[PDB]
Amino acid sequence: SRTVDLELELQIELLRETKRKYESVLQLGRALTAHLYSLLQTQHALGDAFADLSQKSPELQEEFGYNAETQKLLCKNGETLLGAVNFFVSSINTLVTKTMEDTLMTVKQYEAARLEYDAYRTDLEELSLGPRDAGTRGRLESAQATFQAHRDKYEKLRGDVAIKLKFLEENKIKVMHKQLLLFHNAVSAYFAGNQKQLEQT
Amino acid sequence: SRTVDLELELQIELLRETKRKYESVLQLGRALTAHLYSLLQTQHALGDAFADLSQKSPELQEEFGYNAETQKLLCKNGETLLGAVNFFVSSINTLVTKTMEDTLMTVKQYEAARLEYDAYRTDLEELSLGPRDAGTRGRLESAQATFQAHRDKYEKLRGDVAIKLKFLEENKIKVMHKQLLLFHNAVSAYFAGNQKQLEQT
Incomplete structure (x- = not known):
């Protein structure tokens, strides 16, 4: 037998699974971030190399310079898509690291008070x-105070949670919109802007 | 007082610089390959993650779905791009690591022959x-003998080098033209067959 709040608890469980899911997404984003930056530096180097060869290889200057163009192209078009991912990732981090952490902060509080x-x-x-003697009644009195008190802290915190929860879910949707958008837009914007130059040259 | 083969030696310096530059292109190419493998591994996961957060989050289904898919796409269209990058690398590696290398072995030999x-x-x-005295004639003959053996070995190797350098150069152009082409196509084909399904949805 333990005080249970089926609704809140479930509500709280969801926030925890969401947060975990959102953290592994934050992990994959930073991975994606690290890799793009690596691909970018390698395409700059590759670009320069194909350059140097074109200038030094008349028998093949076209092919080398041709490829040296795309590479340098895809680079400036990547630095962009990159800064975008750097944004998406940085955004979701805040939503998770601070917005969500603050609510989860109140949950651990609620949960501890509930235990007490x-x-x-x-x-x-x-x-x-x-x-029913005198001495036992004295103790039931002390015990009654503390008990009532601890009931207060519990019920208040249980209130501060259902509230914070509602507000949080507001952001989880607002923030994860502007973000889930910009991200996907920057993506298709990268490829788009790139083909527009690859067909030309 | 060293023997010099002006024109041949110039062609040898070129081969050496070319091979060195081509090894750089090769390293960069392996790098590109590595990062691409990493990226794809990260897009497949970010795709599955985005997928789940859609299946389990109706509050955003769409803004999570048109991201899961966009990712799953960039992974088929990007899995083949890899294949081509691997072909490029493996093609150039053979030209560098076997064809140039062997030709250069004949050069090292010729050089050694020249020194002796x-x-x-x-x-x-x-x-x-x-x-001129009794003694300084048996020695002169023994000297003429050794000399001619080495003169012959040297002239032969010098001939082989010139032939080989000419075939290599022809081969270099043939190989670096077909590959430098397929590569630039593959790269552009990625972005092309890209918008076809992306720009379509």
Whole structure:
């Protein structure tokens, strides 16, 4: 037997799974970030190399310079898509690292108080077994205070949670829109802007 | 007083610089390959993640779905791009690592032959530079013998080098033209067959 709040608890469970899912997405984004930056530096180097060869290889100057163009192209077009991912990632991090962490902060608080409320309650039930004498009543009095108090902190915090939860879910949707968008846009904008120059030259 | 084959030696310096530059292109190419493998591995996961956050988050289904897919796409269209980059690298590696390398082995040999040529030539010139006496004639003959063996070995290798350098150059152009082409196509084909399904949805 333990104080349970089926609705809140489920509500709280969801926030935790969401947060975990959102963290592994934040992980994949930073991975994607690290890799793009690597591909970018390698395409700059490759660009310069194909350059140097074109200038030094008349028998093949076209092919080398041709390829040296795309490479340098794809580079400036990558630095962009990159800064965008750097943005998407940085955004979702805040939503997770601070926006969500603050709510989860109140949950751990609520959960701890809940644990204590049940402890002080149980102490009181225990003393109730004792004889109806004077001395036991004195203790049931002390025990009654603490108990009531701890019931207060519990119920308040349980309130501060259902509230914060609602507000948070507001952002989870607002923030994850502007972001899930810009991201996907920057993506198709990268390829688009790139083909527009690859067909030309 | 070293022997010099002006034109041949120029062609040898070119081969050496070319091979060195081509090894750089090769390294960069392996790098590109590595990062591409990494990227794809990260896009497949980010795709599956984005997928789940859609299946389990109706509050955003769309803004998570048209991201999951965009990712799954960039992974088929990007899996083949890899294949081509691998072909490029593996093609150039063979030209560099086997064809140029072998040709260069004949060069190292020729150079070695040239060094010994001068050694014996010198020895011989010096001998015939002293006084003529019983002894300084058996030695002159023994010297002429060794000299000619080495003169022949040197001239032969010098001939092989010139032939080989000419075939290599022809081969270099043939190989670096077909590959430098398929590569620039593959790269552009990625962005092309790209918008075809992306720009379509």
